[PDB]
């Protein structure tokens, strides 16, 4: 099993957008920003054990950071990971 | 713009081309020299 | 330690407020102090479309230097320099010239 | 490399001088030969890359003393 | 016209990359001069 100390550090934020919103209200999937080194077994286990719901399957993409600039000083943001967590028929959050 | 202007002034500083004056300028200097001989 | 400090009453030695007494509002790690009613600047600031919009010319206090003030003796009624003595393991400030612990 | 295993003779450097004294670099090489030495105390042939005066000093000092020197300075035979 | 720089990442790295500078004496001396000059990117890796 995955230890609970690992399993708390994985989920990072709920992702709020309109693709996320239509995924919830149309296909049971909650979209959430996860740890960059988090595997699909860790995300599945962490939503099973931290929101106490039943997860059908996880799909993970990794989002690349945008090169912004302040003034005349550039900088890339930071890569993050986004997990499309497809729940079962019985869920709320 | 200043960096591109310094490098784009630095373009024909190490050239070789002999029929072109200063590396780039077209001329007839081959025929002028050749006819002088 | 620091001679002029936070809740202390000072008089001003140089400039625009020379001889004006007042209480130290706060003391900034630039070596400056804000003393109430003393170094009044007439700022005028824009009514930002966020949380409340004052507008107008707000008259603030500015930070004067620490060396431009000295703490008011009130037993002599003049400016006075500060020293540090030890009393019962406490490093206390004391007025020079009458040697009184503050 | 061309080092005598007994005496430690590297190749050294020098000059070809000519009749006009023109200096040229050269190398003097040792007379290295690979000879197979019978040791009686061990009843074996230990083969070494000796010079041709490493064989003189083996003929004088004996092969056992020489092998004790090579084992002493970590030269593996 | 076909210019000289026809890029390929795999040849960029196999040729001038870090594991290829570290692979020999003289490339390690290259990295030593780039570190000593103090250089934001040593090799061309990414």
């Amino acid at each position: 099993m995955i230890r609970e100390e690992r399993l708390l550090k994985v989920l990072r934020a709920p992702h709020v957008s309109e693709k996320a919103s239509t995924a919830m209200e149309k296909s049971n999937t909650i979209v959430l920003k996860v740890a960059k080194d988090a595997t699909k077994a860790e995300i599945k286990a962490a939503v099973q054990k931290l929101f106490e719901v039943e997860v059908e399957v996880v799909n993970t993409l990794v989002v690349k950071g945008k090169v912004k600039r302040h003034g005349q000083r550039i900088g890339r943001r930071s890569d993050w990971k986004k997990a499309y967590v497809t729940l079962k028929e019985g869920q709320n959050l | 713009m200043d960096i591109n202007w310094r490098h784009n002034q630095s373009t024909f500083y190490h050239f070789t081309s002999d029929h072109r004056i200063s590396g780039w300028k077209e001329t007839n200097a081959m025929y002028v020299a050749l006819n002088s001989q | 330690a620091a001679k002029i400090r936070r809740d202390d009453e000072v008089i001003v030695l140089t400039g625009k407020d020379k001889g004006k007494r007042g209480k130290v509002k706060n003391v900034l790690s630039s070596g400056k102090v804000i003393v109430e009613g003393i170094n009044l600047v007439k700022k005028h600031q824009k009514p930002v479309p966020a949380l409340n919009q004052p507008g107008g010319i707000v008259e603030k206090e500015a930070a004067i230097q620490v060396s431009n003030v000295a703490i008011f003796n009130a037993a002599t009624g003049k400016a006075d320099r500060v020293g540090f003595r030890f009393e019962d393991g406490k490093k206390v400030r004391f007025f020079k010239s009458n040697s009184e612990t503050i | 490399s061309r080092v005598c295993q007994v005496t430690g003779k590297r190749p050294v450097t020098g000059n070809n001088r000519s009749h006009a004294l023109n200096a040229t670099k050269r190398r003097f090489l040792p007379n290295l030969h690979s000879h197979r030495f019978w040791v009686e105390s061990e009843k074996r042939f230990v083969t070494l890359r000796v010079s041709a005066k490493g064989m003189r000093v083996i003929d004088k000092k004996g092969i056992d003393t020489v092998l004790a020197e090579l084992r002493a300075r970590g030269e593996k035979y | 016209m076909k210019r000289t720089f026809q890029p390929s990442v795999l040849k960029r790295n196999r040729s001038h990359g870090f594991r290829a500078r570290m692979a020999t004496k003289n490339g390690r001396q290259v990295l030593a001069r780039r570190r000593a000059k103090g250089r934001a990117r040593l090799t061309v890796s990414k």
Binding site: E5, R12, A13 | - | - | - | -
Partner: protein, 63 residues
């Protein structure tokens, strides 16, 4: 809280360890990033408090 954590057993710092991570830390990351959580200093103090529990836990366990 530095002597207070210092005077428990290893099992009890594992309990308040898992409760610093569980109850505090995760719920404040989720609460912070969902528009709630006016009080942002809690994130800092929880994080440093987990540092204390892991410090005393390393000092108590063995060397």
């Amino acid at each position: 809280m530095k002597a207070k954590e210092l005077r428990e057993k290893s099992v009890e710092e594992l309990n308040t360890e898992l409760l610093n991570l569980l109850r505090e830390q995760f719920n404040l990351r989720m609460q912070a990033a969902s528009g709630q959580l006016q009080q942002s200093h809690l994130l800092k103090q929880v994080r440093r408090d987990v540092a204390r529990v892991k410090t005393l836990l390393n000092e108590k366990a063995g060397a």
